[model samples]
Target: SGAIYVGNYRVVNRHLATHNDWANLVWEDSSRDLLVSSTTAQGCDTIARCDCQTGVYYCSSRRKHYPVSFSKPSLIFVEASEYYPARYQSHLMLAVGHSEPGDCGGILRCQHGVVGIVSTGGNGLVGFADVRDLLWLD
Candidate 1:
């Protein structure tokens, strides 16, 4: 498990990565709401949350927050079985961000990076989903 501490909220990351040596990627469970930070593919700061009642997904502005985005086959890499059945999906990469372009310089910390859903299976590369695709209520 990994964790992202933003302000007073701590976002839990189920998948794992070591984007930077100093990256504080920790995960913990608390019976309270925490910030689920993410970003747009364009590198804009944002947040993501899933509705418990409807299972619908949503994203909105981290609003006046810091940059968020990532670049690395390793930082985002994860087993498909953790998220869904392999019969339907085979690969998964969680969202992350860097301070520089092309996933260089250093990984973006302090703020939740741009959020995206990238996948690949038997077909080679399946699709890419960014925060822009989420339904924004704010």
Candidate 2:
């Protein structure tokens, strides 16, 4: 019941005792004549919540794809506020500057290609979703 998006996701996760930063989405949804504006991944600042790499995301209602390059994603986590079938993490931890219920299904492509699906989290943080866990619909 959604638009056609690329299925195979290339993940790039860093195994760590993690914390710190933010990223803007870089992709296209020609169906809506949309292109997400960049919001550079940054080291968390002082004016924010207690250091988990503070940044901003639009807490989406949806994106669904890969880029022309289709390379390996270095990192992928986005602004989502609802749970879907494919989510791997309970939530991708990114402190948002603003919270809007949009872009939920958007692709969290970290300059490479499809990495994670925007599953849930907002008003606080976001969650990482795996495309492999999703059931593609027509």
Candidate 3:
């Protein structure tokens, strides 16, 4: 007799958005990839805010004046509730300097009811995904 196996999926594509704030980014994906302006989104892809008083960039969810830094930055969108409070969420990940910001290198972390993923690389007009394959696995 033969046996069957199952596995999850890792969807990939271009055309996603990054944000300075997580909540704003989540809206972008949840809205079916609608183009939200920076003014409305209140976010930025190429900028990470730093504290002005200290004049340095540190990791923290609170505090005003988050420092803005530059790198081959990219945003990743995942349609997983486990990864985001919303049905879908976007993550900010660093990309390879030589290449563009698509889906290249981003680490997904889930802790204390918090989920975050770093983007690899993709253009500003393309988006990717890791859709769940029901036919193959289920």
Candidate 4:
């Protein structure tokens, strides 16, 4: 297993979808090898997402295996409580192009609590941690 697909993931941003044509190119890009869980067994191969490289699903075998050269696993959770009460929770995305809008950046979510207002890259502050909470860590 060289490349892996974790879940039913799709590109949402039009700009990115247009620039990289992620929507149509996810499979043809040659940079993505998707591996999905074939079973529902615990401690087994669970659903996971990863960019392609060297032509294979990196995590196809399992999380313990080194499928991808650079990767970081994270959790996706919803806030149970909020002090600000925002209609929709949004996060800043880290893009590839530093100056451009659809530059493939990391996700930055806002946090509000009794102490005060704060912003955090809950997914982590560096690398390409998308709003989806996945990253290609080196």
- Candidate 2 TM-score versus the reference: 0.30
Whole-model Cα lDDT of every candidate shown, in order: 0.26, 0.30, 0.24, 0.23
Top-TM-score structure, candidate number = 2
Quote the RMSD, in angstroms, for model 3. Answer: 18.0
Q: Which segments of model 2 are wrong by more than 4 Å? A: 1-4, 7-100, 132-138
lDDT digits (tens) for residues 33-131 of candidate 4 = 121122122221122233221111112112221112212222222222223221222332221121211222122122210110112122222112222
Find the candidate with the highest lDDT and give its number: 2
User: Judged by lDDT relative to the true structure, which candidate is superior, 1 or 3?
Assistant: 1
Q: Give stretches of model 4 more than 4 Å off.
A: 1-5, 18-89, 93-102, 105-130, 133-138
Tell how far residue 126 is off in model 4, in angstroms.
10
Per-candidate TM equals 0.21, 0.30, 0.19, 0.19
Model 1: per-residue Cα lDDT at residue 121: 23
Alpha-carbon RMSD of each model: 13.4, 16.5, 18.0, 16.3
How much does candidate 1 score in TM-score? 0.21
lDDT rank, highest first? 2, 1, 3, 4
